[PDB]
Amino acid sequence: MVNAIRTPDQRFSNLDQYPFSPNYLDDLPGYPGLRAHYLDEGNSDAEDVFLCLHGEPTWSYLYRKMIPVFAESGARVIAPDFFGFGKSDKPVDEEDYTFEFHRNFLLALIERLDLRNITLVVQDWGGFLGLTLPMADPSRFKRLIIMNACLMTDPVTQPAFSAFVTQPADGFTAYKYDLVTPSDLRLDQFMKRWAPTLTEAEASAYAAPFPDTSYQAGVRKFPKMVAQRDQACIDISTEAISFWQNDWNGQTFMAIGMKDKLLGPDVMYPMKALINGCPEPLEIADAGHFVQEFGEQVAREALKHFAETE
Q1: Considering 48, 81, 89, 124, which one is annotated as catalytic?
Q2: Catalytic residue (choose from 260, 266, 286, 305)
Q3: Domain-wise residue ranges, the chain
Q4: Class assignment of domain 1-310?
């Protein structure tokens, strides 16, 4: 029912280091006629399940270095693409994209696949949305691996989760400007700017999902949602703080990309205090916003920390 377009499959012909088979879902409750892509790697009947959520403006490709490490530890890996990203259908209207549009999609995915013993792996929007999921069904979640992210609550409740929007000028201000203003937005270039270590092939893999601007409605709406938080988003995110502080009783691992001008130390330490039982954060000096690009390290250390308490 919701007007959407689909990226030609040929756009993903030569993906660098992405040998993962596609899986799709078009029968989701509340999303009729919308096909959703997701990766399901590792033992299908595995007990532990890593749920890797991507942010703005990437896709499951972002976890390409972490998936193998998780799979080889004997776990199942689910890395879905949000509507408007990767190989999932992309609604053409920005107004179709809301906080609950993406959040309800995650809940639908979880129930449809009946995922349990989940180790939530989040970052950026994967965290903004992902961190509000456990409180809706606590029994399905076991662990959490958090990288540069927080909760989209109001400024009074947590000034740290709003301060980065305005300052500094070369932080989120420069980020959002690069995404919502160009007539001809080239994500391969944006990524090389915000992830200086990407190779030419890896950068193009982030542009692959979008042939032209009409495919980028979800990409233009995400940054706007961080700056303009609607009531549902504030109430939901504010209620999540209470979950992480008093109700959370699972293992947690935190990694911070120190060179991140958006969600670095300024945001992560206040986040660590809110998460009950959150241990000392692994600081990755050379890492920026897209911490997953230095993902093999994070994955190994996380499994190490978790394994020690198994």
Answers
A1: 124
A2: 260
A3: 1-310
A4: alpha beta
